[PDB]
Amino acid sequence: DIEYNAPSEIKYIDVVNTYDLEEEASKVVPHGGFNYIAGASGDEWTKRANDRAWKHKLLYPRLAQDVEAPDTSTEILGHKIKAPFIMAPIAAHGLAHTTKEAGTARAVSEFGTIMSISAYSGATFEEISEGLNGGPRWFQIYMAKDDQQNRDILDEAKSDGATAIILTADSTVSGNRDRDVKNKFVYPFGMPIVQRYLRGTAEGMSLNNIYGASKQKISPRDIEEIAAHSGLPVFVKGIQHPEDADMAIKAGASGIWVSNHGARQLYEAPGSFDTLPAIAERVNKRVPIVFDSGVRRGEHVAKALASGADVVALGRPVLFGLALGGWQGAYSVLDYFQKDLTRVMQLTGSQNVEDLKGLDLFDNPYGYEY
Amino acid sequence: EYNAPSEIKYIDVVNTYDLEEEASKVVPHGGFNYIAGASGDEWTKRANDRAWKHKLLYPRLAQDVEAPDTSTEILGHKIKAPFIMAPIAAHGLAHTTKEAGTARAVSEFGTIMSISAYSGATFEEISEGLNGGPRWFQIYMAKDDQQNRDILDEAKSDGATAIILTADSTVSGNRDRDVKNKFVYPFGMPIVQRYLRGTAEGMSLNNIYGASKQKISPRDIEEIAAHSGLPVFVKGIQHPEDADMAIKAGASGIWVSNHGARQLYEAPGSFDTLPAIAERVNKRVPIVFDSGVRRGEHVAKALASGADVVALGRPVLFGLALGGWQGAYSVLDYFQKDLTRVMQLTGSQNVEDLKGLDLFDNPYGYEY
Amino acid sequence: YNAPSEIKYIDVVNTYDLEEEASKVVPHGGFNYIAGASGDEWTKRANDRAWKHKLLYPRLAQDVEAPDTSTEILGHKIKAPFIMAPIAAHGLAHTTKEAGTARAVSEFGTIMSISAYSGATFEEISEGLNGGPRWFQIYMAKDDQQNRDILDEAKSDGATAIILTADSTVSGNRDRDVKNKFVYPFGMPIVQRYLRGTAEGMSLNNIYGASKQKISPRDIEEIAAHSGLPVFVKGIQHPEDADMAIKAGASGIWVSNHGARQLYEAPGSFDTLPAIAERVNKRVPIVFDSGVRRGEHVAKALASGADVVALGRPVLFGLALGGWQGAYSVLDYFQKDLTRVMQLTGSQNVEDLKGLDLFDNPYGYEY
Amino acid sequence: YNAPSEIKYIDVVNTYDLEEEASKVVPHGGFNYIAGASGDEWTKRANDRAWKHKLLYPRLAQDVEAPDTSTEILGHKIKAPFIMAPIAAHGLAHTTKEAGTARAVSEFGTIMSISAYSGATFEEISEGLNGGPRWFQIYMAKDDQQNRDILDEAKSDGATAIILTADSTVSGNRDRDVKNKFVYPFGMPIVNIYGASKQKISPRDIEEIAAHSGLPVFVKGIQHPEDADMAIKAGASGIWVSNHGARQLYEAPGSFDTLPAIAERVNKRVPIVFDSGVRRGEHVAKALASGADVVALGRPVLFGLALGGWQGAYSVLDYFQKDLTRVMQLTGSQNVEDLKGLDLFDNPYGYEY
Ligand SMILES: Cc1cc2nc3c(=O)[nH]c(=O)nc-3n(C[C@H](O)[C@H](O)[C@H](O)COP(=O)(O)O)c2cc1C
Ligand SMILES: Cc1cc2nc3c(=O)[nH]c(=O)nc-3n(C[C@H](O)[C@H](O)[C@H](O)COP(=O)(O)O)c2cc1C
Ligand SMILES: Cc1cc2nc3c(=O)[nH]c(=O)nc-3n(C[C@H](O)[C@H](O)[C@H](O)COP(=O)(O)O)c2cc1C
Ligand SMILES: Cc1cc2nc3c(=O)[nH]c(=O)nc-3n(C[C@H](O)[C@H](O)[C@H](O)COP(=O)(O)O)c2cc1C
Ligand SMILES: [Zn+2]
């Protein structure tokens, strides 16, 4: 019986930059829930590495490129989207706002991109569907120890309009998240979307014990099985080593999702962006690549595409915007990324999004302190 | 309502970095942060500064050097040191004597004044500060072809001997200080009023840049050259292929610059880009370098890395804020003296000596 | 000297926080004796930042569940790839002294390393051990007969390997201790003997000064010959000293810079490990120490050529905080911390850890 | 000018602490003239962080006991491989000025470098030196007669070598001195101050002093290997690697980073002195392993002199010898020659690691 008082205000916000939104959202979100969202593993040195990796590869300004009115629109697996970013799957939007995942979904569908719905969302998929208003959605799952539980949840996703499946596999056990331990934080909501399918070790499960209850012993046959049952495109999420990309494709994955889980999993690992080129090279344009874990600016969207990604996923900045203004606050953030990217396209000489994929990047061996 | 400083006096310059905080005391908040500020969290502005520690000067002994000669020459103009004034908008934000005051200091010193299209002063006000001194005109292009012809023709009539095409501001950088301060201009821009719906007064740079031409292409470099019949510099080059592009479209000079980190964010420090560009230029045309020059050591490093002159921006505008034409003059004199000390200590008798200096590579970076 | 005496299990969210916590319970002189290092402690900071030079890869669909941290060094089967480092005078941290540490170590299921400069007798220690494995760390006497006596008493006590620490012929420049004028507040039974009196009221400079300075390879061969025990050479940072130690009949290489308490303006210990491993060529086992604070550091060490790592400061901050139970909590933490890292990197057993790809970070700490 | 006057032994745990200690006792302008450097002092910091680029290895079972720090330079037998750097106006630090430093150096047992610009006469310095060995540092004057006048004067005082400091034909940009409007509170008996000296120093000037003084000549301020090669060919008998304690050219390398390239070029043709940022025994070791034969000490000796006069400067020289002895034991060096053969660990990460 835990009291949780999330903000409920709905409103547009001014976004000068997304970094300032973290301090701003701290003032309106309960301490434990805010720090669950903002924190990462150990020292949080790898979360800083996710941010600072963007300074390793620098953009060139380009002059007399015959560019005017850049077009940020793109296409992924047949989905026409307004900008080359989507919403990453996160199950804890209820910590940021009372409208939970329905608030984000509405912002994302109004904006005109893809909403990734974690199966373990605190919002009911009737609250969420109203938010989406017909909009494209993907479903994120953990592998469960029970095969029937897996079939049922996959069926549930398809029945809920899902057009791809995201299997997050970098999470077989939890990362060592010092804020959450120190704050003795307990996630207060349930999982309405999948509660009726929970079997065995997943019985009575929440986000509090989800890592241990789910499947540790994931292998490539799991990727194949999931793909076979659903028949929807499968993204394998959490990839940081290029060998795992080879494996995922050989296993029948329809996309590669480069991520370190916002640095909330393995500690003393590289910043996610540093891992991307090796992965893109191994993929060799075989399947679409989504990249996340550290995206905060339009320069970062540009850098990632230039480095081999097709689209990027946004996380924390959108949740901070949702805390600050509900669906409209989240929308303000997506609007921000869109306008930010179109300036960067103009100044780097990119007419459209495919042009971004071919930018020259300046190598900065000096790193952050320069 | 905009209360710019108006005192004219020489200033003591120990270094140029100190002038920033000094100007912040006398310049109104809005205008001051417009001058001082850069894009994003200003990391590339800091990279502009720190890029200077990446290549270090060697002191050289028994070099047979005395009373170094800082004088040089670029496109026919004999100048007293290898720097010119950078084209900078709206000097009225720093001092009431505006562009006419900077023009006076630059001309008394004996280098070239660059005139920004976004000047708050008319060609005639600037020209009476210059008193016959050399000037280049920096154009922010209108969309309309005849307006460009008219702006170029006024510039040339007034006595401009080069044109500078600034092509790195087709849209504005993300300059957070200005967004947060809600910065608008307190006065108009005579040279470009013709394509602004309004004067410029009460307008944002976003919308003034938005009024200028976005779809610049190599044709614009060819056409400006052919119309004006003057050397054309292409300004804002950070990528070597743009330098080759420019020269091939008919440019007579390359101006390496990142707009003092006021444009594209998360891009390199301007000085780190210089050798690759100078390599591609391969001595076909002269190179101006700018963005982060603060010391004589910086002038020397810039020349040793392939530049022919550097342009000075923020320090001279801080000088103007603090002392009008005499203040700006104080800054120019500082640079000349600072370079003079560096030339003696590095074993360089003239500017040409500076272009051949060895540099120590520093792979450690700023923290060493 | 009022060392704490409370015995309780500890929560370890991370080992770094233990240092500040132990600060409030351990007397000033002794705390800083434990915490401090040479010079301005730059090399101690190097020990810690070296871990960011090589970074771990998360791995997926690895077919891994319940990872197994157990391994075997020499004869001994141990529950995780780490051991207790030899550390003097545990009485500075807790009244239960070395007996407290010995209990936590044997209950956990690893090897206790006994310092020659302990404040507890072989008898006090054997009692906390309850038949648990032990290695004896010698700081040599100048007198040969005394070295034989010491070695005999240790082997008689149950030691199954000898560790010759050779990186302390002379004390390091430990500014904290100089400024605090630190002297031991109790005696050292084992080396008494060659101290011309007691170790009580003596400084470490002079206790080290009493020990042998002219250690040569002959000492390694003589220790081994007399012992009939596996001999470790501790304090190696240069690959040439590993050739040397093996040539002289060493059965193990212990890679260490003494927790940065000795040669100042030297590298972080982790950065020296690969060249040493390269040179040793698995001829003898490698113990690595100096800066281990996380399970990630255990996995990186092993992945870089170590066979086990030795834990020091954190166990002693644990002991200060909770006696044998606090110390146990630290050991339990490292084991649980490594099991997590093993799951996330896709390692089923300790041998997999040794085969991990690492990611090169040329940028260093600030990235 | 109120300089400190107390004489006393100091205990030094490190030389770094002396700067803040001396600052409480030395007049503000004089103190900042000593402690300060060119520009925002980034190259002073580089002089200090340079030592972190090459790291010492501990070595074990090296059969070493009681290391010997004594060595020999140009026939001079000294108690440790360091000497006193020539420094102006010791009277800024202490009322006993250059005599006090002289006595500390003499009694410890090494070579005193006498600056042309000292506030003490040769006779005052000779009194402190008490027979102890001395070298004379010259800023060349424009007038040839004036140069050989001071050279003969140095010789007759018993100078056994000449230091040609050539890295200072004009002053560095010392912001502390300009901002403090610092002026010397006394004169220079022996000889705006930099401008009166020779600016147009050429190789000839080296070959002239070499050939005419009858003394061995060090050329001081070298940071580029080509100036070492020039100086040897011009008749120099020693190369002195220095950036003048970062008081001259700004935005130049840390002195220690320049050493290996110069030593490789000199190629043991003549002795090498090294200075600019030596603060620990670890530093003396590293400089010797990087190709120096001796190092010269500057600011830490002056802070010692400020804190306890001749005896305070002695405590600093005593510290360095004790520091090096510890380093020698731990690196496996029985003697100074061994130090020169030490391997160094390359640290590409620099200071922040
Ligand atoms: C509070 C929080 C909760 C998360 N929960 C999940 C989740 O339930 N499922 C999933 O696949 N990823 C989860 N992620 C990882 C995100 O999908 C994504 O990789 C991450 O937010 C990107 O990092 P960034 O937000 O700092 O840019 C979570 C991330 C955060 C910050
Ligand atoms: C206040 C200010 C206004 C500027 N206005 C213009 C302009 O109107 N036209 C132009 O070509 N560059 C403009 N610039 C860029 C400068 O020409 C030059 O590239 C830059 O000042 C050099 O960087 P620095 O001053 O930091 O050394 C401006 C720079 C500043 C600081
Ligand atoms: C308080 C303390 C005492 C030490 N005493 C000894 C000792 O008696 N014998 C020895 O071989 N090493 C001694 N060491 C060094 C350790 O064996 C080991 O190399 C070091 O603690 C590992 O560094 P870390 O604790 O920072 O990880 C001592 C270390 C500490 C912290
Ligand atoms: C206060 C002061 C005055 C100096 N005066 C001279 C001088 O007169 N002649 C000279 O050759 N070098 C002079 N030097 C430089 C020293 O010879 C030497 O290169 C420097 O002190 C070494 O750097 P460090 O003391 O920081 O280690 C001076 C240095 C200092 C600190
Ligand atoms: Zn002659």
Q: Give the whole-angstrom CA distance, residue C43 versus residue C188.
A: 29
Nearest in space to D328 (alpha carbons), one of D146, D59, D84:
D59
Which position has the token pair 């939890």?
Answer: A174
Residue B314 CA, closest ligand 2 atom number: 25
Pairing of strands A165-168, A137-141: parallel
Q: Give the whole-angstrom CA distance, residue A39 versus residue C315.
A: 27
Nearest in space to B311 (alpha carbons), one of B257, B246, B250, B237:
B257
Q: What is the DSSP letter of A61?
A: P
Q: Which experiment gave this structure?
A: X-ray
Which position has the token pair 């001395």?
Answer: D134
* A364 lies within 8 A of chain B by CB: yes
Q: Give the whole-angstrom CA distance, residue B315 versus residue B317.
A: 6
The per-residue b/e assignment along A143-168, b for 16 or more CB within 10 angstroms, e otherwise, is bbebeebbbbbbebbeebbbbbbbbb
Pairing of strands C252-255, C231-236: parallel
Phi, psi (rounded to 5 degrees) for D79: -80, -15
* D194 lies within 8 A of chain B by CB: no
Can you say whether residue C74 is alpha, beta or left, with left for phi > 0 and alpha for psi between -120 and 50 degrees?
A: left
Half-sphere exposure of A32 (CA within 13 A, CB side): 13
Cβ–ligand 1 distance for A18 under 6 Å, the answer: no
D116 neighbors D194 (Cβ within 8 angstroms):
no
CA B284 to chain centre: 22
The per-residue b/e assignment along C126-149, b for 16 or more CB within 10 angstroms, e otherwise, is bebbeebbbbbbbbbbeeeeebee
Can you say whether residue B316 is alpha, beta or left, with left for phi > 0 and alpha for psi between -120 and 50 degrees?
A: alpha
User: For D223, which of B17, B58, B368 is closest by C-beta distance?
Assistant: B58
Pairing of strands B232-237, B163-166: parallel
* Interchain contact, C56 vs A170, CB within 8 Å: no
CB C214: neighbour CB atoms within 10 A?
Answer: 15
Return the bridge partners of B328, or none: none
| Angle formed by the axes of helices D299-331 and D281-289, nearest 10° | 70
Distance from CA of C28 to the nearest CA of A (A): 27
Comparing alpha-carbon positions, the chain C residue that sits nearest to D16 is: C40
Q: Give the whole-angstrom CA distance, residue B151 versus residue B141.
A: 9
Please list every residue in chain A whose beta carbon sits closer than 8 Å to the beta carbon of residue C337. 176
- Atom 28 of ligand 3: nearest residue by CA position: C87
* Type of residue numbered D31: F
Half-sphere exposure of D149 (CA within 13 A, CB side): 9
C316 neighbors C93 (Cβ within 8 angstroms):
yes
**Is B259 a residue of the active site?**
yes
Ligand 1 mutation target, pool A18, A47, A90, A180, most atoms within 8 A of CB: A90
Q: Give the whole-angstrom CA distance, residue C263 versus residue D282.
A: 9
A29 neighbors A95 (Cβ within 8 angstroms):
yes
Q: Indicate the length of chain D as a whole number.
A: 353
User: Which CATH number is A180's domain given?
Assistant: 3.20.20.70
How far, in Å, from the CA of C38 to the mean position of ligand 2?
50
Distances in Å between the Cα of D308 and the Cα atoms of A313, D24, D83, D96, D118 are: 66, 13, 20, 10, 20
Please list every residue in chain A whose beta carbon sits closer than 8 Å to the beta carbon of residue C61. 169, 218-220, 222-223, 236, 244, 247-248, 251
* Interchain contact, C341 vs A181, CB within 8 Å: no
* A2 lies within 8 A of chain B by CB: no
C43 neighbors A153 (Cβ within 8 angstroms):
no
Q: Give the whole-angstrom CA distance, residue D72 versus residue D78.
A: 6
- Atom 29 of ligand 2: nearest residue by CA position: B88
Distances in Å between the Cα of A315 and the Cα atoms of A88, A294, A295, D270 are: 5, 9, 8, 65
Nearest in space to D288 (alpha carbons), one of D109, D75, D54:
D54
- Tokens of residue A211, six digits: 């890592």
Cβ–ligand 1 distance for A294 under 6 Å, the answer: yes
Largest CA distance in chain A: 64
Cβ–ligand 4 distance for D221 under 6 Å, the answer: no
Q: Residue A243, SS3?
A: helix
Return the bridge partners of A117, or none: A139
A151 neighbors A173 (Cβ within 8 angstroms):
no
DSSP A189-228: ---TTTGGG--GGGTT--TTTHHHHB-S---HHHHHHHHH
Q: Which residues contact A12 (CB under 8 A, 6 or more apart)?
A: A325, A328, A329, A331, A332
How far, in Å, from the CA of C349 to the mean position of ligand 1?
29
* B345 lies within 8 A of chain D by CB: yes
C68 neighbors C339 (Cβ within 8 angstroms):
no
DSSP B12-74: --S-SHHHHHHHHHHS-HHHHHHHH--STTSHHHHHHHHGGGSEEEPP--S----S-B--EEE
Phi, psi (rounded to 5 degrees) for A239: -75, 130
- Tokens of residue B29, six digits: 């908040």
- End-to-end, the C-alpha distance of chain C in Å comes to 44
* Interchain contact, D58 vs C262, CB within 8 Å: yes
Distances in Å between the Cα of A153 and the Cα atoms of A194, A196, A205 are: 7, 10, 14
- Tokens of residue B205, six digits: 């740079």
Residue C139 CA: which ligand is closest? 3
Range of the domain at B244: 1-368
- Atom 7 of ligand 2: nearest residue by CA position: B88
D274 neighbors D259 (Cβ within 8 angstroms):
yes
- Tokens of residue C174, six digits: 């430990």
Half-sphere exposure of A356 (CA within 13 A, CB side): 29
Q: Give the whole-angstrom CA distance, residue D119 versus residue D305.
A: 15
HEC per residue, B169-221: CCCCCCCHHHHHHCCCECCCCCCCHHHCCCCCECCCHHHHHHHCCCCCCHHHH
Which position has the token pair 């020539």?
Answer: D86
Nearest 5°: CA angle at A85, between A94 and B42? Answer: 95
- Atom 13 of ligand 3: nearest residue by CA position: C87
HEC per residue, D246-277: HCCCCCCCCHHHHHHHHHHHHCCCCCEEECCC
Nearest in space to B365 (alpha carbons), one of A52, D255, A367:
A367
Nearest 5°: CA angle at B33, between B27 and B39? Answer: 160
Give chain C's domain count: 1
Q: Give the whole-angstrom CA distance, residue B92 versus residue B106.
A: 16
B74 neighbors B39 (Cβ within 8 angstroms):
no
CB D21: neighbour CB atoms within 10 A?
Answer: 17
Resolution (A): 2.1
Q: Which parts of A are annotated binding residues for FMN? A: 89-91, 118, 140, 168, 237, 259, 292-296, 316
Residue A47 CA, closest ligand 1 atom number: 26
Q: Which residues contact C165 (CB under 8 A, 6 or more apart)?
A: C86, C137, C138, C139, C234, C235, C258
| Angle formed by the axes of helices C16-23 and C313-345, nearest 10° | 160
Q: Residue B165, SS3?
A: strand
Size of interface A-B (CB pairs under 8 A): 109
Cβ–ligand 4 distance for D117 under 6 Å, the answer: yes
Q: What is the DSSP letter of A162?
A: -
Cβ–ligand 1 distance for A292 under 6 Å, the answer: yes
Q: Give the whole-angstrom CA distance, residue C183 versus residue C207.
A: 10
Cβ–ligand 4 distance for D165 under 6 Å, the answer: yes
Distances in Å between the Cα of D322 and the Cα atoms of A319, B159, D340 are: 60, 73, 18
Question: Count H helices, E strands: chain C?
Answer: 14, 12
C170 neighbors D330 (Cβ within 8 angstroms):
yes
Please list every residue in chain A whose beta carbon sits closer than 8 Å to the beta carbon of residue C62. 218-219
Return the bridge partners of D174, or none: D38
Q: Which residues contact A255 (CB under 8 A, 6 or more apart)?
A: A77, A164, A233, A234, A235, A236, A287, A288, A289, A290
How far, in Å, from the CA of B87 to the mean position of ligand 2?
6
Q: Give the whole-angstrom CA distance, residue B103 versus residue B129.
A: 5
Cα dihedral C340, C341, C344, C347 in deg (nearest 10): -110
Percent helix, percent strand, percent coil in chain B, to nearest 5: 45, 15, 45
Q: Give the whole-angstrom CA distance, residue A236 versus residue A249.
A: 9
Q: Give the whole-angstrom CA distance, residue C339 versus residue A360.
A: 42
D3 neighbors B14 (Cβ within 8 angstroms):
no
Can you say whether residue A184 is alpha, beta or left, with left for phi > 0 and alpha for psi between -120 and 50 degrees?
A: left
Which position has the token pair 């949702």?
Answer: A322
Q: Give the whole-angstrom CA distance, residue D205 versus residue D219.
A: 11
Q: Which residues contact C271 (CB under 8 A, 6 or more apart)?
A: C46, C50, C53, D345, D347
Q: Give the whole-angstrom CA distance, residue C160 versus residue C78.
A: 14
* Type of residue numbered B44: T
